[model samples]
Target: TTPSRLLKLVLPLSTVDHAPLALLVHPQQPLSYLERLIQAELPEGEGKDEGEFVRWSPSTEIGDFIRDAARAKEFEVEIEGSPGVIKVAVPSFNDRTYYLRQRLRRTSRKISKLAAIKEECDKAAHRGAQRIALAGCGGLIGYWYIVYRLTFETDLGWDVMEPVTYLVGLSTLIGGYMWFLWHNRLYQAKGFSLQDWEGYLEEANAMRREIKAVASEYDVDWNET
Candidate 1:
């Protein structure tokens, strides 16, 4: 249930001012018949306030906000119905300054995280390459050792076991080296590096700023909060 004061504010804001109004709701705000009636009376475009306000329920999922924002864009309306108190302002475009600042900070954090991921990937690739080289060298050494033992050493009786072991070891080493090569190629192709992720983050951040600038021109804040 909304507090009397909040209802007072919402009633007038939704009914009289004809301005965009955002409902600051909470988890305890129960869904009831009365709530439905209020939502039904909310505005739609330039007509009388009679459309349901958009709701944005908060979640721990990152995709939730992104999806909500996209949906909000389609209607060109700002409504904050998240399960927490939020400072909402009409003329949503005016909040572009705030969104820009927040997005910049977010981008910086993403970049930092990407740097760590990139460093780990580099270390892993290097280790894999070193192992491949060692395995290759070991295979060559085993072949030489088998030839020496079979040809020079006497009473070894043709040593079928020794030749078989040499062949098996050589095949294992080649397989290891080839496996590492393939693994590295897969990683590179997936663009899993910090630089690659950073590119996406940078593009998103830039687009947010551009959109904010456009909103500012019309004296609005794109963020609902």
Candidate 2:
């Protein structure tokens, strides 16, 4: 006999063979129990196994997957147990950063914020370039039409700048917008992956600072990453 779902869990730590290392555990799947009052005449080879019939085995993929999946889900926690039991949960992946993950999380948020701002600015500037171009030459005559109108048809009675200056400004803005769009895409494509984090000093130092925050009181090596 076995539980409905064979699963293992990765908990904080509370084990017998292991000290208080693997601890966290979610609510148990209700224990299933079944017992039969067999007649004395019944043969020995005829009975269902129940009442502590164990079907749990993590080596099997289905068993391992459920344990991993359970830990990945939300759960409640309590500190009411001692050197633990098989009921305790344990992480299949033990090497994950406990605190440095927060470091990179904050850093990711910062980078995402900046990326969003750059995207907005780039999009707006591109739109502005479109507006200026429309007001400049022609839906039909276009950029060249600026020169055509200015060189032949328009008068020389300009105030702040000449119409030739408008043509130059319009052409330059359109070209500059194009160049910036490309560069902005290039810049956006650049990133700092945790995979390449040895040189990531800002986040690393921030983690160091957080650890050292209470070093004088606890008196252990203040390291989390």
Candidate 3:
């Protein structure tokens, strides 16, 4: 965020304002700093989370701009160290949508419902998947115990050993891969974008007042910007 010292921040998708997240540059600086963003490998698709962003190293010129901009905005600029996995944001406000913030904040509550739905679905599947994975992993461990304990405590030789060892190894292989697959799904869900629904939300918010009125008729609380 600064040329002297910068702090790194890892923010969740939930922290973003209604406006699409974007970059800031100094008035006099060139677009060099932004090149990192353009060049960095980003995951494809709209459903994004924290990992969509990549590390950004700003040049001294851009860092100069960040310093003054930070002072003006009254919030610290983006952190410099390892910054964060970068996600795309509004590049500049010059031609940005009118009433963008107002509209977004006004409908933020409802827009969040979509994210909530995703959140709950991820939670349920992750919960079930993990327990299932654990059960599978536990089977592997138990199978080994059976092999080790049986081989040591009894006199069972190769006569009954070949099939037992094959079964144990196969169970471990299958269980390991199954858990790995489920674990990857959870990891991907962490970085998914809630903003994928932003466009849809803006359309709905065109009738914000009417929607709020309807909510009132239903005795629901309607609060917004």
Best-fitting candidate, scored by lDDT: 1
- Give candidate 2's TM-score: 0.26
Overall lDDT per candidate, in order of appearance = 0.49, 0.42, 0.48
- Which tens-of-lDDT digit does each residue in 28-123 have in candidate 2? 321111011122212321221112433333223322333434444321121113222223233322222344356656766666666676677679
lDDT of 3 by residue, 45-132 (tens): 1211222233233443543333333323322223233334332222122112234445556557666776777788778889999999
Once fitted onto the true fold, the runs of candidate 3 whose alpha carbons sit more than 4 angstroms away are 1-101, 158-160, 167-225
lDDT (Cα, 0-100) at 172 in candidate 2:
86
Worst 10 residues of 1 by lDDT: 1-10
| Candidate 3: 10-residue stretch with minimal lDDT | 5-14
Runs of candidate 1 exceeding 4 Å displacement: 1-102, 125-129, 145-225
lDDT of 1 by residue, 34-119 (tens): 25545576631121111134443322232223233333332222333422332221323323244445665676677777677677
State the TM-score for model 3. 0.33
- Estimate the TM-score of every prediction: 0.27, 0.26, 0.33
- How far off is residue 22 in model 3, in Å? 40
